[PDB]
Swiss-Prot record:
Oligomer and partners: Microtubule inner protein component of sperm flagellar doublet microtubules.
UniProt protein name: EF-hand domain-containing family member C2
Subcellular location: Cytoplasm, Cytoskeleton, Cilium axoneme; Cytoplasm, Cytoskeleton, Flagellum axoneme
Protein origin, superkingdom: Eukaryota
Role of this protein: Microtubule inner protein (MIP) part of the dynein-decorated doublet microtubules (DMTs) in cilia axoneme, which is required for motile cilia beating.
Coiled coil: none
Domain DM10: 7-109
Organism: Homo sapiens (Human)
Tissues expressing this chain: Expressed in airway epithelial cells.
Length: 117
């Protein structure tokens, strides 16, 4: 034991979210872009906005599925292009992922979906 191997490197997904602020009856919004990291080693997730500012990040930890499945955590199999994930009540829309991630998914039998556009 003790062999050096980096076979559990993070998977990265590009996602966006719309900050929709309801003003009386009119809703204004802006688009925020994030990078979602999934760590195979411990199934933890981290989110960061590449761009007192609120909502720019989510620390690395295991994230529960949204109701009614909060007794379970998100796994690597819940992430794909054209799929939505919900962290702390906010909906993230995954639209891409790098080559390394696409290759990793293929190696574990996952078919990566076509572009959302």
């Amino acid at each position: 034991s003790g062999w050096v191997a980096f076979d559990k490197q993070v998977l990265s997904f590009d996602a966006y979210l719309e900050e929709e602020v309801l003003d009386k009856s009119q809703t204004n919004y802006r688009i925020r872009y994030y990078k979602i990291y999934f760590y195979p080693e411990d199934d933890t997730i981290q989110v960061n906005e590449p761009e007192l500012l609120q909502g720019t990040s989510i620390r690395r930890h295991r994230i529960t599925l949204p109701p009614p499945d909060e007794d379970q955590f998100y796994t690597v199999y819940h992430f794909n292009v054209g799929t939505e994930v919900v962290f702390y009540g906010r909906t993230f829309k995954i639209y891409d992922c790098d080559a390394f991630t696409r290759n990793f998914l293929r190696k574990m039998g996952v078919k990566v979906n076509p572009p959302v556009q």
